[PDB]
Amino acid sequence: SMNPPPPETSNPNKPKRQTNQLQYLLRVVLKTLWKHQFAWPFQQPVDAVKLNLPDYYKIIKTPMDMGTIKKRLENNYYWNAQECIQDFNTMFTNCYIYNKPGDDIVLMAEALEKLFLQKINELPT
Template identity: 40%
Template sequence: MKRKRGAGKRKSNKPSTGGAGEVFVEPGYYSDRNEENDELESRTEIETRAVHTKLYGQHVIKKIMKMEAAAPFNAPVDPIALGIPDYFDIIDTPMDFGTICSKLESGLKYRNSEEVFKDVGLIWDNCCKYNKKGSLILELMKRVKTNFKRQWTAAGLHREQSTLTTGKNGLCSCWCCY
């Protein structure tokens, strides 16, 4: 039994070469980078960032919460107990480290470290917005903020500068940071 010419030859997955070392590549030959793969890679990258944020972000927040100066920022402000009934008239979006920690533990609230950093920024902004210049709470906030930034950066949890307004110290733009 004779074989037909070319039958039984293995087809190579490599591009064919012509004379003089030229390589002929069929359109779409290197198409393993398609939309489906890009989407999968994107999802994997997002999931990896979320896990990194959860583990390291939670570690940093818990470490900050142990600071004596951080005590006023560890739980939601209770305007009645503190005798500041106008708090919610002035502060639209309250935030505290305990709430951030709970969001991190749930694993559903933050997609990346920038989102966590933004919530931490609310703590600083709210403190500056409600309290008077020179008050003890502002001094405590500045100490906690400086320590937080150091820990956050050391953990590799950077935020995108272009998405946040920053003051002279790179932490925020509120009046009390100048």
């Protein structure tokens, strides 16, 4: 099988806006995670073809990655911050579903998730 198309990063039917919280998600949260030593497997969609995982997209029906989130933020795709937070959580959860507890990639995702929650918590009033 081919890979699926990546998640949409624009949609002419979906109202969009810029907000202070969404700006923080791009300038602080995404930027911090993007630069982390463990970011690289998450900076683009899972290429199931390259990685020889014919079942990845049989098991993961809601794929997400930081390259997609980066583009969504840059494109002002979202209406609210909780939509973006959900995208990060989908990304982490997909990793935990496909892989086993304690796997190398799961520990990497767990470290990114800890950092993610810390940056969200730091969002100033």
